Amino acid sequence: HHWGYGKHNGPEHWHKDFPIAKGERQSPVDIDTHTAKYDPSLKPLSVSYDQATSLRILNNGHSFQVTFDDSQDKAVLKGGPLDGTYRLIQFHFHWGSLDGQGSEHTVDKKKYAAELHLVHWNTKYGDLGKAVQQPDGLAVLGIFLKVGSAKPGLQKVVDVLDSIKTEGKSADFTNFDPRGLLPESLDYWTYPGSLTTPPLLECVTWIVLKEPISVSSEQVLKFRKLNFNGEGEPEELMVDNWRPAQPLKNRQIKASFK
């Protein structure tokens, strides 16, 4: 029972191998806009992706992922609620079997069509190994996708998906600019949480953007062509690869905007 998203190995089963799944600071959560309170002390987010160097794109059996060279301070995230500078290591997506669902975070219980996660680690903790042991060792920038006009910045990604259809396939993926994946506003919500996949470590400062990016139906249709399965294995279409909202428990969600 390697983990997945189906009836027999999905999010309801994860706690058996990773008991932190019933922990105190699990993600995603629902963001209720009545209770997510504006914090005037929150600094604007600093996203510097201009020197990002992408390495590869891969189907890992739970999503598709684009990886980055994190050997030095090129593509970094800082400011906002964050201490120190955070290096981008990868991004991936979550999406649904139809446009009406797919995002992991929700806003006033509304599910978006997809959710993009840009994963960064805190350099003040030396390496990724020591970072994930710390409550703010990772920062994940979360961005909602809604269906509308095409995002030109997403095109180079979706157009190579046919080359990584099944679990375990990968391809060289150089000179991709993650700047093209961002909405206009960097207005955000932030709270302390976890990885939304095993091992579910409670090491993430979540930064979820208020403004969704719009992507075309054509584009999101390319997401749904991916497989959970390996090459030549019976088809398990990669859709609904999202963990549902987990209990907020004691936590406060802060808004950077009024």
Ligand SMILES: [Zn+2]
């Ligand atoms: Zn994996």
Ligand SMILES: [Zn+2]
């Ligand atoms: Zn994710």
